[PDB]
């Protein structure tokens, strides 16, 4: 397949994506499009959001279905169908505490303030509850790296800006994203990759 | 193999593995918890939400994931890997939208606003997406049903709930619906499950 990735120039949903192709070694057009685009880019979408990755002239969208796309019969899966499962779990988990943040707020102060409540308030309760499922293991699942480890590791990049001491109480979730990043596939692209915020 | 559901007493983010089961004919129990017992069942799960499905003495969680590992290998999947995440991407679709609403909001002028909003604005530019994604086709994704057009009915149900003339422009998705709804071991389940406003 020829594959051409759609996103904005930032990590956000597309960062899953790019990470199991760098880590797959596989050859992709990394296409980042400028906000002065988006209304063309956006009437060709499916929903109207972007990540899209285009693969042989077909369309597939959703961040997340995507990157499950893509790791299918790779070693990034889950080993079994329960471990499977727990890959999605967790993944879901995350997921779902990202779609906590008011990305896309347009009043500052009021968006700051929400970041701040969220990352207070809630994710310490997450945090914990990583830390417990994760346990003495190397990996969230099995006892080999998943793309579910992946996503903790991106998804904890972009908390960490908001929050510096995030995982101060949690050096076992610091340990795993090292591990992450030390991968040489993946510590190639962290250091490759344009340098954005988000 | 042994399953155990537990949920609140509501079709909500549980009616999914519910249609999975009752279209697999497949046995379980479907344990409907009340709210005074859940701050206790809530302190003992790994990531204290609900749905979670009890396999063979093993807990799963996230109402996707586990409605994904039940129909694996099963006709409700797509019927090859690029179908699969197309399958992926439209629950996916779905879920983001119903996601959107505050649910759990208390303050009631903060709730109604966004819902309304929601179902005046956002709603009815999904509806135009799905239906020119379904277009003249029979399902969803390929030529028959998966568990795509499982959550779709779900999903639409709830919304039309609260926004009852939502599909008047789009014959073709009520009709996906009674589609739906039509499948024998579906209407059984429809007609039989404990009647919630969700
Ligand atoms: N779901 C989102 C979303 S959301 O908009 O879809 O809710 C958004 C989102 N990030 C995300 C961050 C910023 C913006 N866009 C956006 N919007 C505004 Cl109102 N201002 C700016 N300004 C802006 C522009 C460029 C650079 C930095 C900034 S700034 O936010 O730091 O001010 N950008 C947008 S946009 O696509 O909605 O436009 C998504 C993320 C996610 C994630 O799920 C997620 C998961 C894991 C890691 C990262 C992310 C993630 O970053
Ligand atoms: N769950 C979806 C989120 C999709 C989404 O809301 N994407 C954003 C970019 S992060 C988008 O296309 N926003 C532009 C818009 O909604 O107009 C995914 O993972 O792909
Ligand atoms: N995305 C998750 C959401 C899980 C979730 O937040 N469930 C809610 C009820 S719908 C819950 O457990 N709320 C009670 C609580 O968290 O205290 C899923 O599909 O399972
Ligand atoms: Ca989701």
Same mark, same amino acid.
């Given at each position: 397949? &020829? ?9 956000? $949903? ?15 057009? @990394?296409?980042?499009? %400028? ?9 060709? !979408? ?7 990755? %285009? ?11 995507? #990157? $499950?796309? !893509? ?9 079994? +169908?329960? +471990?499977?499962?727990?890959? @999605? ?14 990305? #896309?707020?347009? /009043?500052?102060?009021? /968006? %700051?303030?929400?970041?701040? +409540?969220?990352?207070?308030? &809630? #994710?310490?309760? *997450? ?9 003495? =293991?190397?990996? !969230? ?23 510096? @001491? *995030? *995982?101060?109480?949690?050096? =076992?979730?610091?340990?795993? =994203? ?13 250091? =490759?990759?344009?340098?954005?915020? !988000?």
């Amino acid at each position: 397949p &020829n594959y051409k990735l759609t996103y904005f120039n930032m990590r956000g $949903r597309a960062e899953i994506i790019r990470y199991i192709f760098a880590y797959l070694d596989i050859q992709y057009e @990394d296409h980042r499009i %400028e906000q002065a685009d988006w209304p063309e880019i956006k009437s060709t !979408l499916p929903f109207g959001k972007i990540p899209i990755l %285009e693969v042989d002239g077909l369309t597939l969208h959703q961040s997340l279905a995507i #990157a $499950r796309y !893509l790791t299918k019969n790779t070693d990034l899966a889950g080993n079994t +169908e329960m +471990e499977q499962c727990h890959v @999605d779990a967790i993944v879901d988990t995350l997921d779902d505490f990202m779609s906590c943040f008011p990305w #896309a707020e347009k /009043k500052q102060d009021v /968006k %700051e303030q929400m970041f701040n +409540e969220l990352l207070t308030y &809630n #994710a310490p309760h *997450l945090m914990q509850d990583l830390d417990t499922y994760l346990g003495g =293991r190397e990996w !969230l699942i099995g006892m080999s790296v998943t793309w579910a480890d992946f996503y903790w590791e991106i998804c904890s990049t972009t908390l960490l800006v908001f929050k510096p @001491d *995030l *995982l101060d109480n949690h050096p =076992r979730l610091v340990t795993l =994203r090292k591990k992450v990043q030390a991968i040489p596939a993946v510590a190639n692209w962290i250091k =490759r990759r344009p340098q954005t915020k !988000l």
